[PDB]
Subunit: 141 residues, 2 copies
């Protein structure tokens, strides 16, 4: 749709920041489209990932970090609030201890900080979605 | 790039048909972009899949069929002729007994027919690639 995918935006995060994403899967859930959101430490796509969030729509979600080039301990969830064929609204809030992921207004996943969120310099949203909205909030000190 | 992705084309296949695909991954291999090619029995994306070919670039390839809505026996290969950051040329030939997948001119995967190739009505190419060329040959009786 409107925004380019893969979508990359320079970003800074700290406690109180919110990343808001509105989009739609490009395929029915039977075909297992993916969504991935990565919070990177540099603008380069091969840079480390403080927070990796990968949805296989209809199946599972995996979360991880990639540190000095290596994936660390995977967290896997079978929670699946996303609805087949529907637009979704994803909110990722930076809390003192964790990221909190809201899906269509419902708390759905959390991930404890492994690296300070201040290390983030870039957010990438990619895989099998169209994107109509992306925002990072910058209202807090 | 040039062609829309996801890419869908109505198609017919029989012995001697060749499907030729030229494209490039949208991400470095460290980020595990995917490529998927599905030969469908109807134009609808939820239709059965006579031949499913899914590359996780740098990692593995899985092949399967989806019959009456259900995935059948997965075949997994660790053969990985695709090169990080490079354009690829994929050829899929319909042989009497199997599909043969050539990558950059090199025989790389085969998959025995589970359903007659004459059941195919559509080909879809999707996931994390750009596409510059897609062709189905129609020269044989």
């Amino acid at each position: 749709s409107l925004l380019p995918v893969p979508y990359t935006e320079a970003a800074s995060l700290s406690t109180g920041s919110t990343v808001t994403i509105k989009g739609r899967p490009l395929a029915c859930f039977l075909n297992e489209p993916y969504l991935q959101v990565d919070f990177h430490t540099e603008m380069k796509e091969e840079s480390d990932i403080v927070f990796h969030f990968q949805v296989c729509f209809g199946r599972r979600v995996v979360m991880n970090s990639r540190e000095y080039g290596a994936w660390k301990q995977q967290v896997e969830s079978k929670n699946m609030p996303f609805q087949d064929g529907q637009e979704f609204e994803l909110s990722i809030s930076v809390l003192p201890d964790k990221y909190q992921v809201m899906v269509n207004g419902q708390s759905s996943y959390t991930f404890d900080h492994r690296i300070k969120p201040e290390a983030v310099k870039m957010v990438q949203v990619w895989r099998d979605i169209s994107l109509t909205k992306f925002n990072v909030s910058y209202l807090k000190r």
